[PDB]
């Protein structure tokens, strides 16, 4: 019965509590869908504002750590290149 309800009525239609079984008018369903879309847009805007504030706080907290990690990665890459050059020079020096 639940599968038949989820197959006849859409999952988006069944997910809203304003979809009455006796409401056969499409205008009422359209108005309910518009109200649900407006509420979802407001909730998404509030969640996006909260996430932006949290991301800004985390960036202000860890910008120095990120810069130190980037500098360490650049130093590690330079050290790897220097180690490869030194290994090639050492092999050439041993052959010579």
């Amino acid at each position: 019965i639940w599968n038949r309800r989820e197959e006849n009525l859409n999952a988006l239609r069944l997910g809203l509590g304003y979809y009455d079984s006796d409401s056969e008018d499409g205008e009422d369903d359209v108005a309910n869908i518009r109200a649900t879309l407006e509420a979802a847009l407001d909730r998404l805007m509030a969640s996006a504002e909260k996430g932006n504030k949290l991301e800004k706080k985390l960036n202000l907290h860890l910008g120095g750590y990120k810069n130190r990690a980037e500098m360490l990665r650049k130093k590690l890459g330079e050290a790897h290149a220097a180690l490869e050059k030194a290994r090639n020079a050492l092999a050439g020096f041993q052959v010579l």
């Binding site: 989820e6 999952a11 988006l12 069944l14 997910g15 809203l16």
Partner: protein, 48 residues
Amino acid sequence: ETDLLPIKTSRVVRPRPPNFTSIPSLLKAFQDEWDALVLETYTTREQL
């Protein structure tokens, strides 16, 4: 550890579709699958 017995059978060779022959197509398919899964989870939560 003890109540679960592994099954040793032949590997299910999933056929690669010709549409998923490029990295961008596979990435788009994965993004569409993730969006569909997120929408299904949201619909299931709303229905619950």
